[PDB]
Ligand binder design. Structure first.
Ligand SMILES: *[C@@H]1O[C@H](CO)[C@@H](O)[C@H](O)[C@H]1NC(C)=O
Ligand SMILES: *[C@@H]1O[C@H](CO)[C@@H](O)[C@H](O)[C@H]1NC(C)=O
Ligand SMILES: *[C@@H]1O[C@H](CO)[C@@H](O)[C@H](O)[C@H]1NC(C)=O
Ligand SMILES: *[C@@H]1O[C@H](CO)[C@@H](O)[C@H](O)[C@H]1NC(C)=O
Length: 435
């Protein structure tokens, strides 16, 4: 179902509408131009930013799902219509760990990274960092596995040493980690994304709750139960087979229009939790943004947010000359980073109460931006055409037109204008409000 080049295309009317629980699917050419390498240009540097793949529910959530499925089964006198599978369903999901399907998504990602940048990757060993989370590090290892599988099959590859994960960045309230958030005190106390997501759930779920209970005489459901049954559709699909070849029976319980609501619920939680809807959301992406400026311009980092000044000034942990960089982060920090880079500056603040599509929001949704296995590529290229370098940004293969600089028809800016137009992050935005 899952392809190396295009990601997951099984039951796309449903599987592309699970927000950050959607398996990655390519958005090449959706509301965008081709992602192909322009004629007469050569990539000179690529940064990849990736999430982990599909996983089991967290321990917390696995207990809540198992307690709900168990309670329905305990209490119902009849399992009616599309809910009748619950008669025999056995809750079998594990917790926390990547699923086999999620591991393969990351092997695929590495193969796809090699194939897309083959002319560069042939002679280069990427510099790789991972935020210190087992799922993230495991994803980094699978991406390396796929990259090497591809490289050692290419007779034009000249430097075939495998890359190591060189930097594991601790995750805590006191470690400055640009790939995870933790040190911005006031932001860690924020409840806004939760409050927005709960308000929206309380608006859309009641009608589904009422219809669902009536298919299960003896059962009482809540709004949160609706959300848990919808969550079950993605989690059971990405666990129940090693290739996610079978849509879970939970999925049919809900209509296509209801799936659009659930997708929106996830987009709202990310937008108001971590993106521009949170007053300190984009501030969590300034540290990586300044790290990216340093790499693209081969110049030392200027940052006073969540960089570590020690780690950024040593070539062992932050080389400025490496041609390929790959960093493994998290969905929530990746949303902050994309906002901090200005990439969704055509997105108006999302309606807290009513569905707006990814295309209405100029390419923003949780499923188009941080699906399981999400990746972004930030390229510099040197053209026979042009001659300052040019920069381009791809998020899950969609060319996302840059803001803060005048973009050409291929969505590129001159590198110097790009970095100058990142004035908000270069200034440290409103980081001082953290304290
Ligand atoms: C910065 O990195 C150094 C060297 O790893 C570490 O000892 C120090 O605790 C880090 N400080 C912060 C605040 O991240
Ligand atoms: C949640 O809805 C209440 C009830 O109308 C409203 O007062 C509140 O401002 C909403 N909260 C958020 C964060 O939008
Ligand atoms: C860590 O972050 C806090 C700034 O947000 C800062 O005061 C401190 O200097 C930074 N420490 C290091 C080692 O970068
Ligand atoms: C995005 O818009 C914000 C809010 O107007 C602005 O502060 C920021 O500089 C913009 N970012 C870019 C890269 O243009």
């Amino acid at each position: 179902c899952d392809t190396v080049d295009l990601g997951y295309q099984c039951s796309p009317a449903t599987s592309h509408l699970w927000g950050q629980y959607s398996p990655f699917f390519s958005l090449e050419d959706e509301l965008s131009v081709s992602s192909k390498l322009p004629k007469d240009c050569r990539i000179t540097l690529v940064q990849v930013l990736s999430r982990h793949g599909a996983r089991y529910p967290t321990s917390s959530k696995s207990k809540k799902y198992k307690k709900l499925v168990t309670a329905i089964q305990a209490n119902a006198t009849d399992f009616k219509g599309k809910f009748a599978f619950l008669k025999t369903y056995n809750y079998t999901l594990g917790a926390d760990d990547l699923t086999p399907f999620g591991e393969q998504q990351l092997v695929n990602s590495g193969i796809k990274f090699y194939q897309r940048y083959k002319a560069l990757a042939r002679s280069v060993v990427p510099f790789i960092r991972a935020s210190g989370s087992d799922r993230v590090i495991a994803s980094g290892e699978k991406f390396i596995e796929g990259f090497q599988q591809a490289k050692l099959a290419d007779p034009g590859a000249t430097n075939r040493a495998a890359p190591a994960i060189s930097v594991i960045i601790p995750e805590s309230e006191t470690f400055n980690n640009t790939l995870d958030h933790g040190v911005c005190t006031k932001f860690e106390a924020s409840q806004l994304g939760d409050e927005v997501a709960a308000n929206f759930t309380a608006l859309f779920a009641p009608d589904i709750r009422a219809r669902a209970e009536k298919h299960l005489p003896g059962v009482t459901l809540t709004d949160e139960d609706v959300v848990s049954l919808m969550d079950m559709c993605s989690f059971d699909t990405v666990a129940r087979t090693s290739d996610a070849s079978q849509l879970s029976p939970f999925c049919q319980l809900f209509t296509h229009n209801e799936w659009k609501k659930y997708n929106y619920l996830q987009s709202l939680g990310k937008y108001y939790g971590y993106g521009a809807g949170n007053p300190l959301g984009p501030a969590q992406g300034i540290g990586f943004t300044n790290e990216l400026i340093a790499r693209l311009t081969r110049s030392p980092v200027q940052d006073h947010t969540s960089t570590n000044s020690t780690l950024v000034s040593n070539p062992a942990t932050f080389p400025l000359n490496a041609t390929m960089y790959v960093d493994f982060s998290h969905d929530n920090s990746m949303v902050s980073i994309f906002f901090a880079l200005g990439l969704y500056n055509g997105t108006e603040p999302l309606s807290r109460t009513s569905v707006e599509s990814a295309k209405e929001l100029d390419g923003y949704s949780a499923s188009w931006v941080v699906p399981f296995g999400a990746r972004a590529y930030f390229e510099t290229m040197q053209c026979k055409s042009e001659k300052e370098p040019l920069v381009r940004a791809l998020i899950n293969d969609r060319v996302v037109p840059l803001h803060g600089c005048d973009v050409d028809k291929l969505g590129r800016c001159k590198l110097n204008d790009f970095v100058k137009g990142l004035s908000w992050a270069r200034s440290g935005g409103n980081w001082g409000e953290c304290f």
